[PDB]
Protein argonaute 1 (Arabidopsis thaliana), 147 residues
Amino acid sequence: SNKKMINGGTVNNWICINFSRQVQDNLARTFCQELAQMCYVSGMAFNPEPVLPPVSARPEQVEKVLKTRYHDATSKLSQGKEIDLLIVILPDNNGSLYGDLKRICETELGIVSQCCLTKHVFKMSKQYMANVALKINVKVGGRNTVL
Ligand SMILES: O=c1ccn([C@@H]2O[C@H](COP(=O)(O)O)[C@@H](O)[C@H]2O)c(=O)[nH]1
């Protein structure tokens, strides 16, 4: 047995921010679509469309991009609803960007986030997608089997 979902969580509203200069908008979009579809067939409720299209940003503007995109996406939502998930595409070698992302998400925005490295975006393997679905599920309050 590989791990599976016991209870799938719910991602009704999500957005993607991209920090990789090797990744054009359409690829981030296609990536997120494949990931969304994996989470769904694995047992989640998962909106096949994001609240807003992916945006591309420089690592240097992590604070500004995250806060602004959070604000703009949340504002688009029916009053009282919140963003369930941020998918972030990172350069493979991103230095302090991961840790800065996570501090902002955890302690300022209080948003669930899932980072994905450029190398996996390019490969978009089903095994990778399945693993990341599992991580997401736990993060949004689902439950997975144990080995
Ligand atoms: O200091 C770190 C820690 C993790 N990663 C990457 O982020 C991913 C997972 O992100 P997340 O599940 O913590 O959101 C990985 O596949 C991992 O290699 C980094 O780029 N920097």
The chain has one domain: 1-147. Strands lie at 5-7, 10-11, 14-18, 45-46, 55-56, 85-90, 113-117, 143-144.
